Design a protein around this motif. Structure first.
Motif, PDB file in Angstrom:
ATOM      1  N   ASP A 161      -0.059  -3.160  -7.352  1.00  0.00           N
ATOM      2  CA  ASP A 161       0.894  -3.835  -7.248  1.00  0.00           C
ATOM      3  C   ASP A 161       0.490  -5.246  -7.892  1.00  0.00           C
ATOM      4  O   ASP A 161       0.457  -6.488  -8.779  1.00  0.00           O
TER       5      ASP A 161
ATOM      6  N   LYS B  15      -0.100  -5.537 -12.052  1.00  0.00           N
ATOM      7  CA  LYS B  15       1.113  -5.386 -12.892  1.00  0.00           C
ATOM      8  C   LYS B  15       1.140  -6.543 -13.407  1.00  0.00           C
ATOM      9  O   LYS B  15       1.037  -7.431 -13.023  1.00  0.00           O
TER      10      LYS B  15
ATOM     11  N   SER C   7       2.863   3.359 -14.875  1.00  0.00           N
ATOM     12  CA  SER C   7       2.516   3.590 -13.358  1.00  0.00           C
ATOM     13  C   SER C   7       1.540   3.312 -12.684  1.00  0.00           C
ATOM     14  O   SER C   7       0.386   4.170 -13.591  1.00  0.00           O
TER      15      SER C   7
ATOM     16  N   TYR D  84       0.536  -1.658 -15.345  1.00  0.00           N
ATOM     17  CA  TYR D  84      -0.149  -1.367 -14.983  1.00  0.00           C
ATOM     18  C   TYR D  84      -1.838  -1.639 -15.528  1.00  0.00           C
ATOM     19  O   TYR D  84      -2.222  -0.629 -16.030  1.00  0.00           O
TER      20      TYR D  84
END
Ligand SMILES: Nc1ncnc2c1ncn2[C@@H]1O[C@H](C[C@@H](N)CC[C@H](N)C(=O)O)[C@@H](O)[C@H]1O
Ligand SMILES: Nc1ncnc2c1ncn2[C@@H]1O[C@H](C[C@@H](N)CC[C@H](N)C(=O)O)[C@@H](O)[C@H]1O
Lengths: 234, 235
Positions: free
Chosen positions: A212, A215, A183, A220
């Motif tokens: 994002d 990702k 994350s 990530y």
């Protein structure tokens, strides 16, 4: 008999993220073990910090005199070994050196050509200049999302500057590693832990949302872009 | 959460003692062993030990209680003298029953000779202890490609994704799986053949003439394509 070579390497790994800096020092030391003799008399290390490279260097090489440098006397707290504390760009170098070595410090330098000239003047004939630093995509995710980060020389910048400073290139390589975190918050925890203050809640939330764009299936991305170099006074 | 997957790409220029290529590959594999594996491993099986280039590095850096050494040819035993804690398993590793309850199976520059790698990986899985190690170096499809193109002689090698899929299928997790394609640049085609004889690997003038297709700025290329793997039996 030495032969020139060019190479490309690629792969995957599943490893601890907190040890990136020590892993870079281990990779640089593995190169030292190839190109350099096991025995050296006079070694100068620029920016030793906590000694991640220093530990590996004395373990793999037989040194008779070791000079250690860093900006701040606080690093000696972590420690035939002399100390030269100060800005290396203004310090008087120890002279008649067999090798100058530096891990993950030269990216902080203000005038690299002038520093290289002083490295050339302080080394013996065929003296060793061996270092790791970082290239233009180091922590690129952080630069893209926060606007902060160093401006790094690329490989050709180094090739040019080393040649003009009077060095023979025995090894010059760039590596690009993407670490895949579960994350975005894990990325910041990693940077806080490895030593690379609280942000506001709005900045944090925007950062997590903007991450994002990095990702992948694995997670990530956080990019490290080390450059490794073994060079010789020509 | 302390472990993260990663992917990497490296590129650069270098110099190597061309005579030390196989020893260098052993050292590179050993460095990976040192990074990933515990220093003590009670029972270790080495496949294709040969003259012991990898074996000597393994015993130097790891504490091993039972070292089981395999090679196809008994002649390899002449390169060992008073080796300690060793059990010899001379023969075709593709036909022999593996030793049981292994902490690691290790192999350097031998798996490219295997006729049936998927079945071998099954025997590796069955022989290893829980979360036992499988660590090896081999070669990929561009290995010595200039010699294969010019003389017609050479092996068919698995590529990195082949290994990725086969390891996962056989029940291993992959801690490290990487390839390096390295072109050595010799001064002349003659130096390529001298290198090949030294390392143990009208036609001659046609070979030299044909080598013009591999002329680069630095010299005449000879490619090595080592593949390195650190894997573990899935829990
Ligand atoms: N101008 C400078 N002169 C001397 N040391 C410096 C200078 N700028 C930065 N440093 C030091 O460079 C070090 C860089 C750190 N990344 C630690 C490097 C250390 N060799 C390691 O890999 O653990 C820090 O200790 C800095 O204080
Ligand atoms: N089917 C097989 N079973 C066992 N050993 C084999 C087999 N095929 C080839 N080998 C051995 O694999 C070795 C490969 C050589 N490149 C030597 C590798 C050795 N680990 C070294 O680093 O020197 C040779 O000793 C071969 O005899």
């Amino acid at each position: 008999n030495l032969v020139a070579q060019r190479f490309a390497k690629a792969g995957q790994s599943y490893s601890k993220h907190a040890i990136v800096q020590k892993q870079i020092c281990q990779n640089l030391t593995n190169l030292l073990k190839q190109f350099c003799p096991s025995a050296m008399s006079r070694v100068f290390e620029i920016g030793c910090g906590s000694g991640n490279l220093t530990r590996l260097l004395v373990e793999s090489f037989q040194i008779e005199n070791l000079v250690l440098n860093d900006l701040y006397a606080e690093v000696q707290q972590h420690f035939h070994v002399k100390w030269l504390i100060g800005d290396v760009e203004t310090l008087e170098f120890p002279q008649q050196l067999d090798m100058i070595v530096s891990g993950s410090a030269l990216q902080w330098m203000q005038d690299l050509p002038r520093l290289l000239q002083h490295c050339y003047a302080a080394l013996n004939e065929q003296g060793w200049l061996c270092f790791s630093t970082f290239g233009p995509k180091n922590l690129i995710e952080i630069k893209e999302l926060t606007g902060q980060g160093l401006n790094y020389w690329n490989l050709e910048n180094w090739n040019s500057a080393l040649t003009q400073a009077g060095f023979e290139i025995l090894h010059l390589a760039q590596s690009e590693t993407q670490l895949y975190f579960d994350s975005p918050k894990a990325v910041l925890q990693h940077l806080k832990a490895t030593g690379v203050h609280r942000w506001t809640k709005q900045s944090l939330q925007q950062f997590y949302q903007d991450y994002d764009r990095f990702k992948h299936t694995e997670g990530y991305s956080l990019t490290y872009h080390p450059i490794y170099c073994i060079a010789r006074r020509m």
